């Protein structure tokens, strides 16, 4: 039969009040002849009705795909409430249910360190600025870079990695022209996480 997948919101969306965290329920392998797909949502057991459901969409393997999107309350997601998507077809009683929630467990605050380029990289045209982020729980987290009050784009961040003590760590690498680093520019690694004061902290880095 069909398959259902339930996806959490983005960490950044849950941590900033101004953004719109959403839980997404995706049904694949729907058949043309299947009666209209229906979605019931529950939040900690209670049915709710603000979900937006998109009309079904043909995939190339001759199946259909259906998505229902539930806007969630930041506080609720962070409080560890359980979102349940229940999926069925208009007429038949059979249904499929899926449940998701934030990771359970004592949250830990991330320590954020900045590392300048290795002296050995200094001979190249571009250098790597490193941001180590360690000791955090849960793994849901967001890392960004900026400079001169404007976002930097040329960075990549590793996935969270599980440490011995059950916390997570990761690295972020911002690549910049040597000429920009030694002119004395300040670069900032920004980290967003539920255990940080105001869900936010920032650590800066320039040539010493």
Numbering used by the authors: 237 to 444
Publication text:
Human IgG4, normally the least abundant of the four subclasses of IgG in serum, displays a number of unique biological properties. It can undergo heavy-chain exchange, also known as Fab-arm exchange, leading to the formation of monovalent but bispecific antibodies, and it interacts poorly with FcγRII and FcγRIII, and complement. We report here the high-resolution crystal structures, at 1.9 and 2.35 Å, respectively, of human recombinant and serum-derived IgG4-Fc. These structures reveal conformational variability at the CH3–CH3 interface that may promote Fab-arm exchange, and a unique conformation for the FG loop in the CH2 domain that would explain the poor FcγRII, FcγRIII and C1q binding properties of IgG4 compared with IgG1 and -3.
